[PDB]
């Protein structure tokens, strides 16, 4: 479990910082999207969001993230179907909030361990 956190952390940090550098004027969504814990890390609550933004992001990093989180998922656990905002500004806020909360979850879980 510490192993998956450490594998994911550079991927998450890079995705967030690259978005902060490339995207200008992204509004605050004020939404909670990712549920960090279940109490173990909550792959089934986090995974659908990454599946939903895969076409909008770096598919290669996303695929690595998904492969890591799949290892922390019960096969029986169902995944919510995610609604990605269609409006361009809402869609960037949606992506940005996912990256922020994923970063925060891993940092939180790491302090736990």
């Amino acid at each position: 479990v510490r192993k998956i956190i450490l594998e994911l952390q550079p991927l998450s940090r890079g995705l967030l910082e690259d978005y902060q550098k490339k995207e200008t004027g992204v509004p605050e969504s004020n939404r909670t999207l990712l549920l960090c814990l279940t109490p173990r890390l909550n792959s089934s609550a986090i995974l659908p969001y990454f599946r939903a933004i895969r076409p909008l992001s770096d598919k290669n990093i996303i695929d690595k993230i998904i492969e890591q989180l799949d290892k922390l998922k019960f096969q029986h656990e169902p995944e919510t179907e995610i609604s990605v905002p269609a409006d361009t500004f809402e869609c960037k806020s949606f992506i940005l909030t996912i990256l922020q909360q994923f970063s925060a979850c891993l940092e939180s879980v790491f302090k736990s361990l």
Partner: antibody, heavy 119, light 107 residues
Framework: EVQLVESGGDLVKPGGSLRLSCVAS????????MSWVRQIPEKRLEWVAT????????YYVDAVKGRFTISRDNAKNTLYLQMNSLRAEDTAIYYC????????????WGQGTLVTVSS | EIVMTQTHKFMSTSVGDRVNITCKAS??????LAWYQQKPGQAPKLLIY???NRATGVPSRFSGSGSGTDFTFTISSLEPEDVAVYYC????????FGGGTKLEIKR
């Protein structure tokens, strides 16, 4: 509630140095871009510097490049402005601010810390 | 570097009047403009972003319009607590602020 509290402003002579700190509470500090904005006595606002979540990217306004250094310590929820080779026109209230990406607007401001540079 | 020009340093208004504050950018910034209000002894407060989105809790008498290079900040009916300095700011590229427009009461 989101809170930013600046400290470290003081009087200094031209060519001196000073270190500003901003301690943040009420949000996950490492999730956000952080920035400094200053306001000179004539009340013009000037953006100063910006740092991404984990320090990989920084931008500086030309007036302070090669003299000021922005940095952050995520463990301590603290943003820093290291100010070297200070000049009189650096005299200003320095505000700590939070942003979503590196080029954006400033929705959260601290109360400011006054820096006075004078011979 | 994108220069933001607020032509009027000061404007006289009367309570109950419409106020139009103008800001022009030296190059196209699209809608990537923000408006701030500042009262003495306080930090600036965000009012409008993306030229016309009113930030949370901002009174409905405040509004912004424009896209491109010419922007207008509008108070539909000035209230006494609205006496302040208003600044525009572009975030199309590296941050720059207009020089401020102080509202004062005509008598």
């Amino acid at each position: 509630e989101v809170q930013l509290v600046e400290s470290g402003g003081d009087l200094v002579k031209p060519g001196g140095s000073l270190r500003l700190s901003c301690v943040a509470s009420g949000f996950t500090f490492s999730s956000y871009v952080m920035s400094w904005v200053r306001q000179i006595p004539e009340k013009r606002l000037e953006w100063v510097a910006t740092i991404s979540s984990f320090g990989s990217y920084t931008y500086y306004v030309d007036a302070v490049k090669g003299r000021f250094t922005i940095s952050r310590d995520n463990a301590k929820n603290t943003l820093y402005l290291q100010m070297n080779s200070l000049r009189a026109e650096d005299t200003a209230i320095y505000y700590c601010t939070r942003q979503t990406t590196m080029i954006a607007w400033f929705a959260y401001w601290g109360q400011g810390t006054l820096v006075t540079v004078s011979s | 570097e994108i220069v933001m020009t607020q032509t009027h340093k000061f404007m006289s208004t009367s309570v109950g009047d419409r106020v139009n504050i103008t800001c022009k950018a030296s190059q196209d910034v699209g809608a990537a403009l923000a408006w701030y209000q500042q009262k003495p002894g306080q930090a600036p407060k965000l009012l409008i972003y993306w030229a016309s989105n009113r930030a949370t809790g901002v009174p409905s008498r405040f509004s912004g319009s424009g896209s491109g290079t010419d922007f207008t900040f509008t108070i539909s009916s000035l209230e006494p607590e609205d006496v302040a300095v208003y600044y525009c700011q572009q975030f199309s590229s590296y941050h720059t602020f207009g020089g401020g427009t102080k509202l004062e009461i005509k008598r």
